[model samples]
Target: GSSGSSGIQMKETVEEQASTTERVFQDRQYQIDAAIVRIMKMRKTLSHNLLVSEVYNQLKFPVKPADLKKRIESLIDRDYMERDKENPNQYNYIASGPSSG
Candidate 1:
């Protein structure tokens, strides 16, 4: 029984490693993709001035403001989203882009 349990654990670990590897291959892009997918699912345009509090509310995660900012910046950099020109600090996610429809 012990041997069987260890084998199962080993298999689980290997599967986890493979999934992590795939995510790593995409790097920051993977996080950006996740953020975009989450935002799009809302099906509503976010305000131009996105505050850290707003992101926390939307994500329902207890993430720090700075950390949320970093993720948002990555998404912006990937062109999966963009900042609102009117409000430099705010973000206006592009739902439809050349790469995404």
Candidate 2:
């Protein structure tokens, strides 16, 4: 199974790359969530981009933009934070305190 010419091997390689790429984000998911919540504790009301930027800066590792967005979205889902109902560009930390990540 050195290789293939009918595109099977290439397809498998491409598929592996994508799933592996997805895990890279999920593998780092915990840390980014913690960072986002930590920042919210200090700055309850923050601009969307600022929160994203701060999360990026605070994390000890790299993250993708879409993946970061998903983490933030999950935070909102978890009720630790939320977007401005009137202005979706900003976020509000609604929890009485950070959930300790």
Candidate 3:
């Protein structure tokens, strides 16, 4: 029964770690998405347009404009937002869910 007990313990350890890791990743993703959503909402009414610098300015803490741009680009690639055709650099976010398919 020693081998069986060891196997069970290993399984339990892996399961626990997997769940914890998943939760942490999900929380981080949620934060990023929330920031994206806020930026998108601001874009809807603001005529100034949403730049990465504006996003960095509106954020609570320090955030790299380059990094934020990358995240925004990811959202755009995922169809949560879209870049303006006229101004390829400007973002025109589409209101969509995490899985708005």
TM-scores of the candidates in the order shown = 0.43, 0.64, 0.49
For candidate 1, write residues 5-93 as lDDT tens digits.
35344423334342446544454444444654576435344542434434445554355456556666776676656656676555555
RMSD after Cα superposition, model 2 = 11.5
**lDDT of each structure?**
0.52, 0.77, 0.58
> For candidate 2, lDDT tens digit of each residue in 6-98?
655443333434244655555487788888888886887988888878887887667788888887888887888777878977888788743
CA deviation > 4 Å runs, candidate 3: 1-32, 45-49, 97-101
Off by over 4 Å in 1: 1-36, 40-44, 48-54, 58-60, 95-101
Candidate 2 regions off by >4 Å?
A: 1-27, 98-101
Candidate 3: C-alpha RMSD after superposition: 10.6
Give the local distance difference test score of model 3: 0.58
lDDT of 2: 0.77
RMSD of 1: 10.0
Which candidate should be chosen as best, given TM-score against the real structure?
2
Give the Å shift of residue 18 in candidate 2. 16
